Design a binder for this molecule. Structure first.
Ligand SMILES: COC(=O)c1ccc(SCCc2ccccc2)c(S(N)(=O)=O)c1
Ligand SMILES: [Zn+2]
Length: 258
């Protein structure tokens, strides 16, 4: 099974998942001087109910906060999107070093880490699964994390990480104010792309927030203490879980701001 180790890592994903070599793969390098300001883009409009979060788990590839996507309590609207996209899940990417952890890279700069908020198009598709397979199916909001002062909005998550050391472990997790974790400014870049983990489906409209949020070194280190292995299996740590940037192949990266 795929992972981020020598033998199963990004460079090998294409053996098992051919679309790894597609023309709309993510993440990318965002070169700010080449991005175009699009006055036709709309402001992001976000409503995230703290009662939506239910469960935190170790997938073996990140932690995953799972949200009740039965109805439309928690949604993303606006930006480049047509209609309403329903909140499904949150996870984080990091690397083994604090200066090289994000998936998206801005003018050569890699952040300490990158939070992904995953949503699906409930206005057009009946379920996350059906949406995941369409070009306008999914929308992922990306937030960069930079090293600095500890972030009290991450305490809720970090406090759970011991209980989910092993791959597969899960713990109830509710009253999670995801809105308060986002940066104060919602200016963004957007481009059409893919999942950054197998199955690597090209169904994602990426919305990458310009403004990072803080994390301490000590907070980030706690994530690398998660295992990519299950109970009663040789232990290996998830020290790194980001995919290298992929070729743009002529796609247009747009900015909500000038
Ligand atoms: C290391 O990162 C992850 O663990 C991770 C998990 C889920 C997802 S999205 C849902 C994947 C999925 C699986 C099966 C079917 C349809 C969608 C992503 S991402 N970076 O937004 O592309 C990362
Ligand atoms: Zn992700």
């Amino acid at each position: 099974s795929w992972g981020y180790r020598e033998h199963n890592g990004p460079i090998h994903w294409k053996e098992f998942f051919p679309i790894a070599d597609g023309d709309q793969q993510s993440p990318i390098e965002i070169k700010t001087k080449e991005v175009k300001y699009d006055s036709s883009l709309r402001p992001l409009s976000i409503k995230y109910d703290p009662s939506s979060a239910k469960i935190i788990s170790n997938s073996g590839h990140s932690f995953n906060v799972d949200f009740d996507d039965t109805e439309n309590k928690s949604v993303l609207r606006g930006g480049p999107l047509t209609g309403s996209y329903r909140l499904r899940q949150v996870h984080l990417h990091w690397g083994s070093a604090d200066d090289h952890g994000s998936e998206h890279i801005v003018d050569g700069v890699s952040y300490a880490a990158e939070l992904h908020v995953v949503h699906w198009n409930s206005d057009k598709y009946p379920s996350f699964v059906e949406a995941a397979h369409e070009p306008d199916g999914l929308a992922v909001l990306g937030v960069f994390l930079q090293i600095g002062e500890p972030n009290s909005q991450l305490q809720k998550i970090t406090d759970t990480l011991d209980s989910i050391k092993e791959k597969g472990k899960q713990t109830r997790f509710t009253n999670f104010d995801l809105l308060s974790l986002l940066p104060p400014s919602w200016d963004y870049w957007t481009y059409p792309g893919s999942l950054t983990v197998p199955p690597l489906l090209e169904s994602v409209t990426w919305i990458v927030l310009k403004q990072p949020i803080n994390i301490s070194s000590q907070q980030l280190a706690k994530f690398r203490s998660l295992l990519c292995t299950a109970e009663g299996e040789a232990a290996a740590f998830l020290v790194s879980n980001h995919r290298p940037p992929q070729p743009l192949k002529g796609r247009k990266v747009r900015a909500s701001f000038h």
